[PDB]
């Protein structure tokens, strides 16, 4: 980037600077490819690992609830309610992916929990208290905290934290991963680097 | 399509599509020129309703952005075509969320009573015209 | 534009200045075309959207009244009574299309309501109180206000406001919309602009 | 013809008719020359009845226009050929409407008693004359 | 000719006849000039009988059109050469139809008693004259 | 469009403005051709589909009545009575082709039913009650409503609705249909569009 | 043709047809251009009937998709040309299926009463025209 | 991919973005071939194995029912009823091919069972209870669960689960299978890899 | 976008964007030509209000800059569109800040009473003009 000098609130300057720099964006993207690809290479693994860990630990908690004698019509969690719980855990991935403190992660994930459990559990058979008990069970499996206390005090559901929350136990590495054919066909280590 | 896909398949897609995705962005510039004035419409209809409120109710310089976070999320919920029967719930959801990030509720009750003059922004700017 | 100096009430000067400038109006219209077309291009959409929204919300309110057990002979609303209600809502579009305050919109729409519900509901089976209840229901659907209180106190029907009225939730954009053939056949963004 | 028509069809009509509508306005100038003296008749028969009333009843400079709004709407209702059985209703309708825009009723009762000397204005000024 | 014809054949006719139908409309302008005064005869004989009734019986501004819908459909049935033995049935048919569109029957009995002074309008205005 | 300012009821002005604009109508028609043809292209299909669906469903209802043992002299429905029933169904196509509500469609089709079944079933062997039972059977086949109650209370037949009527289950598309030779002989998609 | 075929034969077909299937997709682009507006017709006729219901009955943001799953499967069953005698069975089938995925039946009875205004979408947009 | 920012429900933007990207789809498909072929190579085997296992175990259950003395006219299961049972088992393949939990698989397969046994067993001699007993017998052969309880409570047949369902005992491998001629004609292992 | 990013990624961006950022500055010269007269407007409206005050109240040569630091920061706060309800707080904030840098308060009370005649400066100087 921004002009970094003053706000100068004026929409026509915004659109005109955009139209001016459209003749340079189309080449800066082509230049940006060369580090774009490697940063995605070592950034997508965190998403895919946290989504598989959510699937696995949700399956374990639901099966331990079924072994207590409940019916599989009592607890659906099929397509969109799992998508809600993946929304809160992926926002936990984001605020852990920055170098934030514990309670700042806790209250940002509590805010995302408020928005998500407000939106998509009206009209679908699942009260908010059961969903928040399920979220506390999943965090008891991951890091063993159970941080969130909830209420249905108004027409929406509201989530507030009780204790600070640790970041995700997954490190995003700064690697430069090379293929096995490049390892085998090379003649020297410096040919792999250089 | 399924959902469950390995880590290698997604990386293999993103790595091999580089040439086609950049030569599609080169045409998306031509498409962005006429569509980019939704930025102008958005900041016009947001500043015209928030600059007097923020400016005359006494809030500072750098907290204006946190108020913009609230108002901008409300305008997104609006221009995804969602009227009052969901708004009467998302208002108290956003009230609790931005209370939780350190605001004061004596500002929030008046601000939530204020944001009903924000409406939808985005329109279409390319007509077909077969002739 | 007018002479902007004094009134000078004299009809013969009016007709004579009109006859004098008829030899320039015929070219100023041809010159005015080039911005006339684009301003209509992005001004007609507000009318067509507010008329479709009136059709839709009137249909919803009438069907919710029919589901309460009424007969379709009780509430005609066929051709001209819908035209009356479109008159009041299109005048609401006008006074919202200017940057007027809330109550100024409210009292101008109340005046147009007075004129319209005076004219075309004498002799056609529909009392004024039912029409004003219908208008209040449509404004409860749109913005949720119900502003108008009415009376049949004299031989005409009279509408007065109780609360300020918000403007229309539709923004008239200042676009310059280009065809898709001009987008595809061009070679550069500046060829689309310039 | 129907009513229900899309947004694109009306814009397509108005955009493609530009040449014909301007070459029709060029002939409508010739037609306007003889028909334009209905302006002269209108302001003659309105000023001749309103300048003494407004001028001697004490109303100011810039409110005379609001009184002209009332009188001009009444003359429009007249010269669309509508006699007293509708006028006895539209008088009290206009009385409430221009009371609602901030006038005083001690002026309005006398003014509504006054406007029965305004009548129709527009005539035709082109005869056929086949010879 | 038959009736049963495909969707493609009618569209094929209407698409290929464009040149001939527009060069026939260009001559139909010359024909319309002398025949267009049936408009003048029609609105003369309809307004001369309806302006006093509507104007003195008390009906408003915008309902006059619905009454014109009734009177104009009756005049169409007339000037397709159909006398009283069908009119004594179509009067009560039109009475029920325009009662169903929200009118009041205390107007309709008097109006159906009124519309017997409307008659046929259209004549011919081109004579052969072989000399 | 009309002058849109005042009525000004005067027939000589009507004929004189018509004579004035006959020197521009003859070119506006030639200009209007270019969208006239495409709008008819995608508008005639609705008429032809609703007329074929009437033929088919009338044939099915009549054959199910013949299988109950009636004679083919009892129920003629040959040329003009089918034309009457096509009049009411084509007016249903019109009031569904606008974006009207359900009961407004119901009462406009009831009015067209009143006019049509008044005119052309006096003197032709078919009572009005049998025709209205046939219309209710055809609407039971299409949308399953049976909306109309009738009476022969006076010398004409009178049709009044009992329930709201849905619009026609046919959508009129805004296509731009291109020939198959233009598809095959082209070299690019933008040559088909542009 | 038979049914029972080995695993190797199908893989052998799919592997060897790569050149012909991609040079057939290159022509299917030309065919897709005019046929792709069934997308526009589909989302027009679905959003025009579901945005007011979902928007005014109170359902949230992310459950709207599950309701779209129900409505979209119903529109598929429609535009494969299947009228009411199968619909009166598939409505209760879909009601039990989307009740089983966690919805509430107090929404479902009203929604199944609502979906009779959705109809068929897809048409054809290529005419033959031998000339 | 989607725009991933907002919904922005507008069909004309949908069709216009499709027309814009048709000039890149035709090359992205040609690029996608190189991993398309190998992923189908190791993905089609799961379908062909589960369809052969259905054929075999259905034949075994039907022959054990015939050995109890029934007639081959009592239980047809010829062409389309086998296609129904293959529909439910192939949907079981899909929801097992994702990493879903046990009861989520159970209720999605129960929903597909509801749709399939609603559609194609009206008018064909086979009651729903016998079909659901057959499905429970096939799952008793595969994994030994018998999960589904059914009812013909309304005009359609409705299937609901009683117990969680395990995924399919078939693993889809991430191989890179090479021909035997490439193995024999090569000179080194790295020539097979590289 | 996130926030938390390594030291190497930002340096990698700034090093690799050199060609594009300099060929964008080459076009930003063309843009700067018409926009650069906000400098002229700014120093006109600041010198016209400060040269008589500084010049006649007795302050020296080289302290005029420190007074310009105060006035220029106030004009920045102004032309970021911030009216009096924030100004009544930022005036005493700036008073304490420039008292802390060694000024005298007998100048500062009169100078803070003086700076209410400074207003916003920056305007836009490029119109769109599609023709």
The answer to whether C118 and E96 have CB atoms below 8 angstroms apart is no
What is the helix, strand, coil percentage profile of chain I, to 5?
Answer: 70, 0, 30
In B, which residues are within 8 Å of G51 by CB distance?
Answer: 81
The token duo for H2 is: 């989607």
Strand-pairing partners, residue A150, are A159
Q: Of E71, E82, E79, which is closest to residue E121 (Cα–Cα)? A: E79
How many beta-carbon pairs below 8 A join chains A and I?
53
User: Could you tell me which of A167, A65, A60, A75 has the C-alpha nearest to residue A126?
Assistant: A75
Chain G contact set for A81 (CB, 8 A): 102
**List of chain B residues whose C-beta atoms are within 8 Å of the C-beta of residue C171:** 41, 45, 119-121, 123
Neighbours of F91 (CB within 10 A): 18
Residues H19, C180: Cα–Cα separation, whole Å: 9
Long-range pairs, C50-54, Cβ under 8 A, ≥24: C50/C89, C50/C90, C50/C93, C50/C168, C50/C170, C51/C86, C51/C90, C52/F99, C53/C142, C54/C85, C54/C86, C54/C89, C54/C138
Q: Which residue has the tokens 């946190």?
A: B66
Tokens linked to H46: 């799961």
The Cα–Cα gap between F102 and C61 comes to: 12
Nearest to E51 among D77, D81, D89 (CB): D81
Asked whether D120 and D81 are in contact (CB, 8 A), the reply is yes
Cβ neighbours of D28 in F, within 8 Å: 20
Distance CA E127, CA G36 (A): 57
* Other beta carbons less than 10 A from residue E74's beta carbon: 18
Structure tokens belonging to residue B27 = 């045409």
Token readout for C180 is 């898709």
Is F129:F152 a contact under the CB 8 Å cutoff?
yes
C193–chain I nearest CA distance, Å? 7
Please, which chains are in contact with E (at least 3 CB pairs closer than 8 A)?
Answer: C, D, F, G
Rounded Cα–Cα distance for residues G100 and G63 (Å):
15
Strands (E), B1-131: 126-127
Question: What is the β-pairing status of strands C148-151 and C158-161?
Answer: antiparallel
Which three-class secondary structure state does DSSP give residue H121? coil
What string of DSSP letters covers chain G?
A: --S---HHHHHHHHHHTHHHHHHHHHHHHHHHHHHTTHHHHHHHHHHHHHHHHHHHHT--STTHHHHHHHHHHHHHHHHTT--HHHHHHHHHHHHHHHHHTT--HHHHHHHHHHTTS--------EE----
Yes or no: say if E119 and C141 are a contact pair by the CB < 8 Å rule. no
Sign (positive/negative) of CA torsion H61, H67, H68, H72? Answer: positive
* Residue A160 parent element (H or E): strand A158-161
Chain G partners within 8 Å of A116 (Cβ): 62
Determine the residue among H16, H30, H37, H101 to mutate to test chain B binding: the one whose Cβ has the most chain B Cβ atoms within 10 Å: H16
Contacts of I8 in chain A (CB under 8 A): 174
CB under 8 Å to I71, separation ≥6 — which residues?
I46, I50, I115, I118
Q: What's the token pair of residue H20?
A: 């814009």
Burial (CB < 10 A; 0-12, 13-18, 19+), residue H114, is buried
Contact F146, F172 (CB under 8 A): no
Collect all residues from D whose CB is shorter than 8 A from any CB in B: 8, 11-12, 16
Give φ, ψ of C73 to 5 degrees. -85, -15
Question: Whole-angstrom Cα distance, residue H177 to residue H174?
Answer: 9
Burial (Cβ within 10 Å: 0-12, 13-18, ≥19) of residue B90: buried
Where would I find the beta strands (DSSP E) of D13-109?
Answer: none
Quick check: C56 contacting F, CB < 8 Å? yes
Of the candidates F143, H113, C37, which has an alpha carbon nearest to the alpha carbon of residue G100? H113
Which burial class, exposed, middle or buried, applies to I71 when counting CB atoms under 10 A from its CB (0-12, 13-18, 19+)? buried
Cβ separation of A124 and G103 shorter than 8 Å? yes
The b-or-e profile of F2-17 (16+ CB within 10 A means b, else e) is: eeeeeebbbbebbbbe
Measure the CA dihedral A142/A148/A151/A152, to 10°: -40
Using alpha carbons only, what angle is made at residue C97 by residues C94 and C101, rounded to the nearest 5 degrees? Answer: 100
Residue (of F16, F18, F100, F87) closest to F50 by Cα position: F87
CA distances from E47 to B82, C186, D35, D120, F127 (A): 51, 58, 23, 17, 39
Q: In angstroms, what CA-CA distances link G61 with A122, B92, C11, E121, H6?
A: 10, 15, 64, 63, 12
- Residue E35 CB burial class (10 angstroms; 0-12, 13-18, ≥19): middle
Q: CB contact, 8 Å: A15 with chain B?
A: yes
Angle between helix B84-100 and A102-119 (nearest 10): 170
Instruction: Considering only the beta carbons, identify the residue of G15, G26, G40 that sits closest to H15.
Output: G40
Distance from C-alpha of B62 to C-alpha of I80, rounded to nearest angstrom: 12
Which segments within H66-177 are labelled E, that is strand? Answer: 148-151, 158-161
Q: G–I contact (≥3 CB pairs within 8 Å)?
A: no
Residue closest to F150 by CA, chosen among F130, F167, F126: F130
Calculate the CA dihedral of residues H162, H164, H167, H168 and round it to 10 degrees. -30
On whether any CB of chain H is under 8 Å from the CB of F194, the answer is: no
For residue C166, give the DSSP letter. -
Interchain contact A70–H (C-beta under 8 A): no
User: How far is A123 from G53, CA to CA, in rounded Å?
Assistant: 14
Both tokens of C75, joined, read 């509430």
CB contact under 8 A, G18 and H156: no
Distance in angstroms between the alpha carbons of the first and the last residue of chain G: 38
Q: Count other C-beta atoms under 10 Å from residue F161's C-beta.
A: 23
Q: How many CA atoms lie within 13 A of H166 on its CB side?
A: 11
Q: How far apart are the first and last CA of chain A?
A: 32
What count of other Cβ atoms lies within 10 Å of the Cβ of residue E63?
A: 23
Provide long-range contacts, Cβ within 8 A and 24+ apart, for H92-98. Answer: H92/H165, H92/H168, H93/H46, H93/H47, H93/H50, H93/H168, H94/B2, H95/H167, H96/H167, H96/H168, H97/B2, H97/B4, H97/H46, H97/H168, H97/H172, H98/B2, H98/B3, H98/B4
Give the DSSP letter of residue B122: -
Residues of I with Cβ-Cβ distance to B57 under 8 angstroms: 85
Q: Do G34 and F183 touch (CB under 8 A)?
A: yes
Which among E56, E60, E61 has CB closest to D83?
E56
Experimental structure resolution, Å: 3.7
Comparing CA positions, the residue from H8, C184, H7 lying closest to residue B29 is: C184
**What CA–CA distance (Å, rounded) separates C2 from C13?**
13
DSSP-derived secondary structure letter, C5: S
Angle at I63 between CA I60 and CA I66, to 5 degrees: 150
CA distance D12 to H4: 33
Q: Do the Cβ atoms of F116 and F87 come closer than 8 Å?
A: yes
Q: Where are the alpha helices (DSSP H) in E36-127?
A: 38-57, 64-79, 84-100, 105-114
Helix, strand, coil percentages for chain E (3-state, nearest 5): 70, 0, 30
Smallest Cα distance from D85 to chain E, Å = 5
Output DSSP code: residue C122. Answer: S
User: Quick check: B4 and H98 CB within 8 A?
Assistant: yes
């Amino acid at each position: 980037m921004a002009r970094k000098r003053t706000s100068k609130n004026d929409p026509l300057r915004m659109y005109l600077n955009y139209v001016r720099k459209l003749q340079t964006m189309g080449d800066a993207y082509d230049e940006s490819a060369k580090y774009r690809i490697a940063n995605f290479e070592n950034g997508f693994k965190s998403l895919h690992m946290v989504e598989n860990e959510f699937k696995q630990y949700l399956a374990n908690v639901i099966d331990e609830a079924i072994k207590s004698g409940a019916s599989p019509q009592d607890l659906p969690y099929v397509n969109e309610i799992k998508l809600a719980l993946m929304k809160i855990f992926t926002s936990w991935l984001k605020y852990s992916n920055e170098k934030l403190g514990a309670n700042e992660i806790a209250i940002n994930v509590a805010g995302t929990a408020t928005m998500t459990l407000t939106e998509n559990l009206y009209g679908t058979r699942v009260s908010c208290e059961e969903a928040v008990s399920l979220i506390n069970s999943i965090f008891a499996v991951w890091v063993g905290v159970e941080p969130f206390e909830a209420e249905e005090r108004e027409g929406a559901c509201l989530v507030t934290p009780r204790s600070p929350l640790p970041p995700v136990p997954i490190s995003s590495p700064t690697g430069f991963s090379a293929p096995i054919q490049e390892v085998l066909q090379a003649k020297s280590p410096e040919e792999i680097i250089g | 399509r399924r959902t469950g896909i390995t880590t290698e398949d997604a990386i293999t897609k993103y790595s091999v599509k580089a040439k086609t995705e950049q030569t599609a962005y080169k045409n998306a510039t031509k498409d962005m020129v006429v569509q980019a004035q939704n930025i102008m419409n958005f900041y016009s209809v947001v500043n015209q309703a928030l600059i007097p409120w923020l400016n005359a109710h006494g809030v500072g310089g750098n907290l204006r952005i946190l108020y913009r976070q609230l108002a901008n999320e409300y305008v997104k919920v609006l221009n995804t075509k969602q009227s009052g029967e969901v708004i009467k719930r998302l208002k108290i959801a956003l009230r609790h969320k931005y209370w939780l990030r350190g605001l004061d509720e004596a500002m929030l009750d008046e601000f939530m009573d204020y944001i009903d003059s924000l409406k939808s922004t985005t329109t279409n700017y390319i007509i077909f015209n077969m002739q």
